[PDB]
Amino acid sequence: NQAQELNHELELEQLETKITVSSVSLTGSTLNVVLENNGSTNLYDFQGFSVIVQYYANISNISTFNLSLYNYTKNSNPSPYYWTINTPLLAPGSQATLTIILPYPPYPNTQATVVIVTNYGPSVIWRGSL
């Protein structure tokens, strides 16, 4: 039966998928996260990822809560609320830099939460200061 086989394959892809955040660094309104693939699946279906950021924007010198979903794009010049990645396929053991275009520059020394979800389900949460 074929639902049985589809679910079999998917659940083992979920078991074997793992990602972690090596480093995070900010420049202007662009956030650069260095993602490392610690699983045994290839990651490439970035349209099906999630990238969610909760941070404190600097709007007219007022520190203002911001929560947003960012969508993937291959566009090399991404708009705010978009992100891109400098590899076509992130293989087990590899790293890649994910570039996220925030709508405002972060207010200095404010905390932030970055959630990165693979297309299979397993995710990573990073909490820190921007």
Partner 1 sequence: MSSYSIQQSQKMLTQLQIDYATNTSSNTVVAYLHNVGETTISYLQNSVVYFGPNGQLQPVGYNSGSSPYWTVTSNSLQPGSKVKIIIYLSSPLSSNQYYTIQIVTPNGYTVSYMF
Answer yes or no: are the C-beta atoms of 72 and 1 closer than 8 Å: no
The verdict on 105 binding partner 1 (CB under 8 A) reads: no
Tokens representing 107? Answer: 């207010």
**Choice between 90 and 101, CB closer to Na ion:** 90
Please name the residues in contact with 33: beta carbons below 8 A apart, sequence gap of 6 or more: 21, 23, 24, 97, 98, 100, 114, 116, 126
DSSP label of 119: T
Question: Of the two residues 101 and 130, which places its CB atom closer to partner 1 in the complex?
Answer: 130
> Quick one: what does residue 121 bind among partner 1, Na ion, none, with the CB cut-off 5 to 8 Å set by partner type?
partner 1
Which token pair is 83? 């992100």
Token code pair at residue 67? 């929560």
The residue among 58 and 124 lying less far from partner 1, judged by its C-beta, is 124
Exposed, middle or buried: residue 119 (CB in 10 Å: 0-12, 13-18, 19+)? middle
Taking CB under 5 A as the criterion, the residue among 14, 29, 30, 42 binding Na ion is 42
Cβ proximity to Na ion, 42 vs 123, nearer residue:
42
Residue 29 interacts with, from Na ion, partner 1, none (CB under 5-8 Å by kind)? none
Q: Minimum CB separation from partner 1 for residue 91, in Å? A: 14
Contacting residue, 60, 81, 91, 115, with partner 1 by CB under 8 A: 115
For binding to Na ion (CB under 5 A), which residues are involved? Answer: 41-42
